[PDB]
Amino acid sequence: TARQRVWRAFENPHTSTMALVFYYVTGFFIAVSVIANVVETVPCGSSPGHIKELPCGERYAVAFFCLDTACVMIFTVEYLLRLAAAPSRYRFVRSVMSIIDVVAILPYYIGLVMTDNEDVSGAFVTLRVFRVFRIFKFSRHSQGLRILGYTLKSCASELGFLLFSLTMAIIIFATVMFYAEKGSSASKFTSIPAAFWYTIVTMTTLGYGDMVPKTIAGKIFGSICSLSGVLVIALPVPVICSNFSRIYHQNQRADKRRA
Amino acid sequence: TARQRVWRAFENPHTSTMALVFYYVTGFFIAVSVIANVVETVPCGSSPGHIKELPCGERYAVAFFCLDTACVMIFTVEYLLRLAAAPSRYRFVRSVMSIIDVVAILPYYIGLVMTDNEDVSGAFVTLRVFRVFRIFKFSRHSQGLRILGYTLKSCASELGFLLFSLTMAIIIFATVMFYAEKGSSASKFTSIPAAFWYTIVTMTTLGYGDMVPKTIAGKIFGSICSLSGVLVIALPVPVICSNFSRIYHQNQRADKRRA
Amino acid sequence: TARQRVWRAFENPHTSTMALVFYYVTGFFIAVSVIANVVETVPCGSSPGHIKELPCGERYAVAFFCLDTACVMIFTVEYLLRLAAAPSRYRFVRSVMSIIDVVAILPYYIGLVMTDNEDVSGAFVTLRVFRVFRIFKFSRHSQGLRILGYTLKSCASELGFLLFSLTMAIIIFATVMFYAEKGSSASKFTSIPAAFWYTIVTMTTLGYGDMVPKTIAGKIFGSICSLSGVLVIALPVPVICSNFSRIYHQNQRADKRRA
Amino acid sequence: TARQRVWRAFENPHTSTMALVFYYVTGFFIAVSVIANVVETVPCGSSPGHIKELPCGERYAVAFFCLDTACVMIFTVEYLLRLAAAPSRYRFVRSVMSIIDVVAILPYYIGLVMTDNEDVSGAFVTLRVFRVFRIFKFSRHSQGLRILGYTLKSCASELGFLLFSLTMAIIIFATVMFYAEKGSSASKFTSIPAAFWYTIVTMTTLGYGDMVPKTIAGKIFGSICSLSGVLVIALPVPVICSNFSRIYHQNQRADKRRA
Ligand SMILES: [Hg+2]
Ligand SMILES: [K+]
Ligand SMILES: [K+]
Ligand SMILES: [K+]
Ligand SMILES: [K+]
């Protein structure tokens, strides 16, 4: 039952000192990979003979490749040990966290098999952001993250209905604004999907101002949309407040009953 | 009392299997019509010999007409059966839902009688958005939609007073901003109705930025308006929170008293 | 004690039928004056021989003068009767409502004494907006306006502290942004008062975008300001919620104890 | 134990009349310094022979230097007396308020030692804003400031987790938006740090509009970001509400138990 010991170490890093040191090393490497990508996209200066500035990941391509190789070796050995200590392979690999880890470390190997044809571009780069979600597994102890997470899980039904009604209101307001503003000169309301942008920006009280109503009817319906946006801001708060109070008191009561 | 059976099927689709299948077919056709309009407004490419791009409903005019004909036949037979199974014709037709359905399927026939003179344009197209409201009748079971709806109905008086006071504050701030900014060069505050737009955009914390105060007094009063907008955002939340908590506990208490 | 009867009619319009009809006439004339000013600022078309469009109050100057004369005669006779039925003249005239009425009907007479020299302009026009506040006395019965008003009166101390801390934070953030952005090219942060505008627009989650940080330090401090603005939006809500719940239950308990 | 008397006067200004008058003098001088800096940055007119307008602190340089000298002498003698009456020198100087006062009055002496080389510029000017924080020590009695401050201290853990999750969401959304919009023409999403600005402006419902998505995928992810911003606005409110209610009732119960 030593594999069970390894899996216990993985699930609860505070059990053994080796578990804690491995968990901290893994968190450090995840943070290093996240910062490495963010910095890699940053455009550094131009070396002599270069017309345009290059990103720190295109000038220092080999250094960032070595760093990514180190991070992916750490992550791969992590996943291999986790699968080896999994009481059930199917049960483990179907969990959301295993999927996140696999899709995080997959674009590296996808690029590896595309190394011979690296001239072509791939969208797999944007999948590296999945490593950021591993940070969340590294920080599941704040005594309030559990409360807020389970509060959102309780709110799921109400917030889903709110999202559905908000989507229907977006369709309605976008239709109204498109038909009010399709006839303006150089108008940005070229269709109802084009007005989806204006409506989602207005009902959230963003107001970029790139799409604004130029007409009078457009302005009337934009005012109605603005007020509906105030209501949109104010609507989830009572639900989350009630569920959070209930869940806080429920967790406290269970704890002190156990106390 | 078979008409009563049909009306029972219409009111509660989960009673019979035929009622459920008809209800699902109706929901599918409503969703198809909504998506059909939204896509119809989308501008597709230009066929050879066409200078300007055409909407998917102007290039594929006949296909979208056939789809609309199918949807309107479904909706018309729905309404005819609903009126035939109505215990009272006047009571049914005066309900808001019958009015919504009638005004949703009316522009189709209005266009039909205007087919001979289809060259002229009509605003009836924008009334097709009423079909979107039928989605709401198709989704009246989420266990929280009833709670939030009846909470808003309870809040009606307070939220109406808040809307009235917000309207009066809009008039006041628009007057002040117009008189502060009427004298600027190329000013957009050409009148007090023109400043209604600036005030309704500022008090909702939108800030498009198309109308901004150029003067110093205009900026002082815009700052006061911004703070009033913070208050506007924060004011309905306590009312909705209190009413929602009360209504949640009331429904729960009634249910468990019946339990 | 007939003057007491008149004052009772004024204070409670529902006592006598004559009181109710006079109160409704007064409300109608107040609304007419408000709409008259708002429409007066609206620019109508240009008559032949006029280069520029004129406001409806500059083209129809005599008609709007007659309407204003009617409204001000009604308001003056109202105030004269109110002072005649006042149990104490000093006590009545020192009330905020008497001051509002006097400053609302004063610019009319100020213009009258300036009729001979009407060529010069005066700011007294913007004081006509005070008549809008009389609407509030005309609508002091909604069963929730009293609750929210007395809730705000209870919150006065906390909301005053919040306004003070918000002002200090505005000074701090404006200083930081000015010193971060004073050196940019064609910068709008020409001083710390100039950055008061940016800070009051950012901390309220308005974001007009007319003043945005162009630098990197400016963007860092603008991000801190944005988060502080989220906190500003979220801070008065708990206070207003707690006070509103307390005041609602207090009024209900007092009423049912009297019931 | 007379030094103890002096320190008691400093800690509680309402004890003696001399303590109260010194405390009010100190508050007056702090406010004078704050207003003096804010006005000093303001650009006044140009005297003859001056091409460009000068700030009130560059034209009236000697007057503002004299005012700053007076304020700094007051603050220095304040700090000297506070250290002389401190029961423990190390304990006093390590408090946050002593640090704030020292860093507030330090740039004055830093400029003094740089008077001979005043041609070079220094960032120490922006540190004068620390004097603003002394206002907060001058206004620690409103009966609600303590409640809100200790409520925020109680919320510290939850709000820290919320800030951490918001930072991770900012990284995720910035990565997605950068990869969606890096390829646009004249795009402002030149890197992931460049999209940190767009994400922090969108998730706070600011919407300056300087950086807006030009693409379709960029607009989809901007809509997701806008909705996440609505959630960001609505998330701290339940936490602050619950903690504020608890802390209000706790302080009230302790007070009336002592009553
Ligand atoms: Hg609440
Ligand atoms: K905004
Ligand atoms: K904007
Ligand atoms: K906002
Ligand atoms: K905005």
Side-chain angles (χ1 to χ4, degrees), chain A residues 1-49 54-115 120-259, chain B residues 1-49 54-115 120-259, chain C residues 1-49 54-115 120-259, chain D residues 1-49 54-115 120-259:
Chain A
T1 176
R3 60 179 284 164
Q4 189 186 10
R5 190 155 55 214
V6 169
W7 172 255
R8 180 186 313 258
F10 282 165
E11 180 177 357
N12 291 330
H14 307 75
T15 55
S16 302
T17 308
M18 64 184 73
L20 183 63
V21 72
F22 201 86
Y23 165 88
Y24 277 173
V25 169
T26 300
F28 165 83
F29 272 107
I30 294 160
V32 168
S33 67
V34 162
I35 304 159
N37 308 330
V38 167
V39 173
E40 156 167 40
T41 62
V42 171
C44 75
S46 312
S47 60
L54 289 188
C56 294
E58 287 183 13
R59 161 146 156 199
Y60 292 166
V62 287
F64 275 82
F65 181 83
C66 290
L67 197 153
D68 199 35
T69 300
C71 279
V72 175
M73 293 183 286
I74 301 299
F75 297 159
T76 299
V77 69
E78 181 180 1
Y79 188 83
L80 286 197
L81 272 69
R82 215 176 201 196
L83 200 47
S88 162
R89 281 82 65 193
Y90 187 76
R91 178 70 275 172
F92 169 70
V93 304
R94 291 291 85 190
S95 66
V96 298
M97 185 63 72
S98 84
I99 308 171
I100 282 171
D101 198 335
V102 162
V103 298
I105 62 170
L106 183 63
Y108 182 94
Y109 294 105
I110 298 310
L112 280 178
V113 299
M114 293 177 70
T115 289
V120 74
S121 60
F124 285 68
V125 185
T126 188
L127 299 173
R128 273 189 266 172
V129 74
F130 286 129
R131 311 193 211 179
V132 186
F133 307 76
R134 278 149 65 71
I135 301 299
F136 292 116
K137 181 266 290 181
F138 188 80
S139 188
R140 292 183 291 113
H141 284 72
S142 286
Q143 283 287 347
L145 61 84
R146 50 183 202 88
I147 302 180
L148 213 50
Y150 197 70
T151 297
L152 273 187
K153 295 309 281 182
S154 283
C155 279
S157 75
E158 178 66 29
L159 291 183
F161 162 71
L162 274 168
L163 198 50
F164 158 79
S165 64
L166 174 70
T167 298
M168 293 309 111
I170 277 164
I171 310 287
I172 289 157
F173 277 124
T175 297
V176 172
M177 294 299 291
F178 164 62
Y179 280 115
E181 289 260 358
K182 60 182 287 305
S184 289
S185 68
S187 170
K188 310 209 162 135
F189 299 79
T190 75
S191 63
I192 297 192
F196 286 171
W197 179 238
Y198 169 82
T199 315
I200 189 53
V201 159
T202 303
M203 294 185 76
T204 56
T205 67
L206 258 179
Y208 287 133
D210 59 357
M211 293 177 70
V212 290
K214 298 293 183 182
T215 51
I216 293 182
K219 275 169 184 188
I220 301 170
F221 296 122
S223 310
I224 312 299
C225 201
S226 315
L227 298 167
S228 179
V230 163
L231 207 55
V232 162
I233 293 290
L235 264 185
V237 183
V239 187
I240 299 183
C241 185
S242 76
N243 293 13
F244 177 90
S245 301
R246 192 271 316 278
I247 284 285
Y248 193 92
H249 287 349
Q250 190 169 11
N251 276 335
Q252 186 201 13
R253 194 220 72 85
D255 192 14
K256 68 178 175 288
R257 174 198 170 165
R258 286 194 261 112
Chain B
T1 176
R3 60 179 284 164
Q4 189 185 10
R5 190 155 55 214
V6 169
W7 172 255
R8 180 186 313 258
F10 282 165
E11 180 177 357
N12 291 330
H14 307 75
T15 55
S16 302
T17 308
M18 64 184 73
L20 183 63
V21 72
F22 201 86
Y23 165 88
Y24 277 173
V25 169
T26 300
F28 165 83
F29 272 107
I30 294 160
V32 167
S33 67
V34 162
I35 304 159
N37 308 330
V38 167
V39 173
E40 156 167 40
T41 62
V42 171
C44 75
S46 312
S47 61
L54 289 188
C56 295
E58 287 183 13
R59 161 146 156 199
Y60 292 166
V62 287
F64 275 82
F65 181 83
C66 290
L67 198 153
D68 199 35
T69 300
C71 279
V72 175
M73 293 183 286
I74 301 299
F75 297 159
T76 299
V77 69
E78 181 181 1
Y79 188 83
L80 286 197
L81 272 69
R82 215 176 201 196
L83 200 47
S88 162
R89 281 82 65 193
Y90 187 76
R91 178 70 275 172
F92 169 70
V93 304
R94 291 291 86 190
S95 66
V96 298
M97 185 63 72
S98 84
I99 308 171
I100 282 171
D101 198 335
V102 162
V103 298
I105 62 170
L106 183 63
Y108 182 94
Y109 294 105
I110 298 310
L112 280 178
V113 299
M114 293 177 71
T115 289
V120 74
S121 59
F124 285 68
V125 186
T126 188
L127 299 173
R128 273 189 266 172
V129 74
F130 286 129
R131 311 193 211 179
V132 186
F133 307 76
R134 278 149 65 71
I135 300 299
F136 292 116
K137 181 266 290 181
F138 188 80
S139 188
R140 292 183 291 113
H141 284 72
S142 286
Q143 283 287 347
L145 61 83
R146 50 183 202 88
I147 302 180
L148 214 50
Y150 197 70
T151 297
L152 273 187
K153 295 309 281 182
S154 283
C155 279
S157 75
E158 178 66 29
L159 291 183
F161 162 71
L162 274 168
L163 198 50
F164 158 79
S165 64
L166 174 70
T167 298
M168 293 309 111
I170 277 164
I171 310 286
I172 289 157
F173 277 124
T175 297
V176 172
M177 294 299 291
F178 164 62
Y179 280 115
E181 289 260 358
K182 60 182 287 305
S184 289
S185 68
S187 170
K188 310 209 162 135
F189 299 79
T190 75
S191 63
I192 297 192
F196 286 171
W197 179 238
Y198 169 82
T199 315
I200 189 53
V201 159
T202 303
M203 294 185 76
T204 56
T205 67
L206 258 179
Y208 287 133
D210 59 357
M211 293 177 70
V212 290
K214 298 293 183 182
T215 51
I216 293 182
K219 275 169 184 188
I220 301 170
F221 296 122
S223 310
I224 311 300
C225 201
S226 315
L227 298 167
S228 179
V230 163
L231 207 55
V232 162
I233 293 291
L235 265 185
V237 183
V239 187
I240 299 183
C241 185
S242 76
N243 293 13
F244 177 90
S245 301
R246 192 271 316 278
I247 284 285
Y248 194 92
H249 287 349
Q250 190 169 11
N251 276 335
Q252 186 201 13
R253 194 220 72 85
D255 192 14
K256 68 178 175 288
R257 174 198 170 165
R258 286 194 261 112
Chain C
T1 176
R3 60 179 284 164
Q4 189 186 10
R5 190 155 55 214
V6 169
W7 172 256
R8 180 186 313 258
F10 282 165
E11 180 177 357
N12 291 330
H14 307 75
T15 55
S16 302
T17 308
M18 64 184 73
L20 183 63
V21 72
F22 201 86
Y23 165 88
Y24 277 173
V25 169
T26 300
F28 165 83
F29 272 107
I30 294 160
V32 168
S33 67
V34 162
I35 304 159
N37 308 330
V38 167
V39 173
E40 156 167 40
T41 62
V42 171
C44 75
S46 312
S47 60
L54 289 188
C56 294
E58 287 183 13
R59 161 146 156 199
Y60 292 166
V62 287
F64 275 82
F65 181 83
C66 290
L67 197 153
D68 199 35
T69 300
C71 279
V72 175
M73 293 183 286
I74 301 299
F75 297 159
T76 299
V77 69
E78 181 181 1
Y79 188 83
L80 286 197
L81 273 69
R82 215 176 201 196
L83 200 47
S88 162
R89 281 82 65 193
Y90 187 76
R91 178 70 275 172
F92 169 70
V93 304
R94 291 291 85 190
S95 66
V96 298
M97 185 63 72
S98 84
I99 308 171
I100 282 171
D101 198 335
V102 162
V103 298
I105 62 170
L106 183 63
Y108 182 94
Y109 294 105
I110 298 310
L112 280 178
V113 299
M114 293 177 70
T115 289
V120 74
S121 60
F124 285 68
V125 185
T126 188
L127 299 173
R128 273 189 266 172
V129 74
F130 286 129
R131 311 193 211 179
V132 186
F133 307 76
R134 278 149 65 71
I135 301 299
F136 292 116
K137 181 266 290 181
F138 188 80
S139 188
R140 292 183 291 113
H141 284 72
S142 286
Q143 283 287 347
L145 61 83
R146 50 183 202 88
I147 302 180
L148 214 50
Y150 197 70
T151 297
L152 273 187
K153 295 309 281 182
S154 283
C155 279
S157 75
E158 178 66 29
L159 291 183
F161 162 71
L162 274 168
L163 198 50
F164 158 79
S165 64
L166 174 70
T167 298
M168 293 309 111
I170 277 164
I171 310 286
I172 289 157
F173 277 124
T175 297
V176 172
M177 294 299 291
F178 164 62
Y179 280 115
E181 289 260 358
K182 60 182 287 305
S184 289
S185 68
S187 170
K188 310 209 162 135
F189 299 79
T190 75
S191 63
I192 297 193
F196 286 171
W197 179 238
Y198 169 82
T199 315
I200 189 53
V201 159
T202 303
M203 294 185 76
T204 56
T205 67
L206 258 179
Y208 287 133
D210 59 357
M211 293 177 70
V212 290
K214 298 293 183 182
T215 51
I216 293 182
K219 275 169 184 188
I220 302 170
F221 296 122
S223 310
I224 311 299
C225 201
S226 315
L227 298 167
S228 179
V230 163
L231 207 55
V232 162
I233 293 291
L235 265 185
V237 183
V239 187
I240 299 183
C241 185
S242 76
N243 293 13
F244 177 90
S245 301
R246 192 271 316 278
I247 284 284
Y248 193 92
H249 287 349
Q250 190 169 11
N251 276 335
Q252 186 201 13
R253 194 220 72 85
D255 192 14
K256 68 178 175 288
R257 174 198 170 165
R258 286 194 261 112
Chain D
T1 176
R3 60 179 284 164
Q4 189 185 10
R5 190 155 55 214
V6 169
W7 172 255
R8 180 186 313 258
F10 282 165
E11 180 177 357
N12 291 330
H14 307 75
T15 55
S16 302
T17 308
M18 64 183 73
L20 183 63
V21 72
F22 201 86
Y23 165 88
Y24 277 173
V25 169
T26 300
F28 165 83
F29 272 107
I30 294 160
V32 168
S33 67
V34 162
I35 304 159
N37 308 330
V38 166
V39 173
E40 156 167 40
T41 62
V42 171
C44 75
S46 312
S47 61
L54 289 188
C56 294
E58 287 183 13
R59 161 146 156 199
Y60 292 166
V62 287
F64 275 82
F65 181 83
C66 290
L67 197 153
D68 199 35
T69 300
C71 279
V72 175
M73 293 183 286
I74 301 299
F75 297 159
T76 299
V77 69
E78 181 180 1
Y79 188 83
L80 286 197
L81 272 69
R82 215 176 201 196
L83 200 47
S88 162
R89 281 82 65 193
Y90 187 76
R91 178 70 275 172
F92 169 71
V93 304
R94 291 291 85 190
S95 66
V96 298
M97 185 63 72
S98 84
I99 308 171
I100 282 171
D101 198 335
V102 162
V103 298
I105 62 170
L106 183 63
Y108 182 94
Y109 294 105
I110 298 310
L112 280 178
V113 299
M114 293 177 70
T115 289
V120 74
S121 60
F124 285 68
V125 185
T126 188
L127 299 173
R128 273 189 266 172
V129 74
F130 286 129
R131 311 193 211 179
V132 186
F133 307 76
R134 278 149 65 71
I135 300 299
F136 292 116
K137 181 266 290 181
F138 188 80
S139 188
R140 292 183 291 113
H141 284 72
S142 286
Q143 283 287 347
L145 61 84
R146 50 183 202 88
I147 302 180
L148 213 50
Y150 197 70
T151 297
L152 273 187
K153 295 309 281 182
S154 283
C155 279
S157 75
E158 178 66 29
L159 291 183
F161 162 71
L162 274 168
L163 198 50
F164 158 79
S165 64
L166 174 70
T167 298
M168 293 309 111
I170 277 164
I171 310 286
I172 289 157
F173 277 124
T175 297
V176 172
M177 294 299 291
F178 164 62
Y179 280 115
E181 289 260 358
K182 60 182 287 305
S184 289
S185 68
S187 170
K188 310 209 162 135
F189 299 79
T190 75
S191 63
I192 297 192
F196 286 171
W197 179 238
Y198 169 82
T199 315
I200 189 53
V201 159
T202 303
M203 294 185 76
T204 56
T205 67
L206 258 179
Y208 287 133
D210 59 357
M211 293 177 70
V212 290
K214 298 293 183 182
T215 51
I216 293 182
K219 275 169 184 188
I220 301 170
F221 296 122
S223 310
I224 312 299
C225 201
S226 315
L227 298 167
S228 179
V230 163
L231 207 55
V232 162
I233 293 290
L235 265 185
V237 183
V239 187
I240 299 183
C241 185
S242 76
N243 293 13
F244 177 90
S245 301
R246 192 272 316 278
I247 284 285
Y248 193 92
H249 287 349
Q250 190 169 11
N251 276 335
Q252 186 201 13
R253 194 220 72 85
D255 192 14
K256 68 178 175 288
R257 174 198 170 165
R258 286 194 261 112

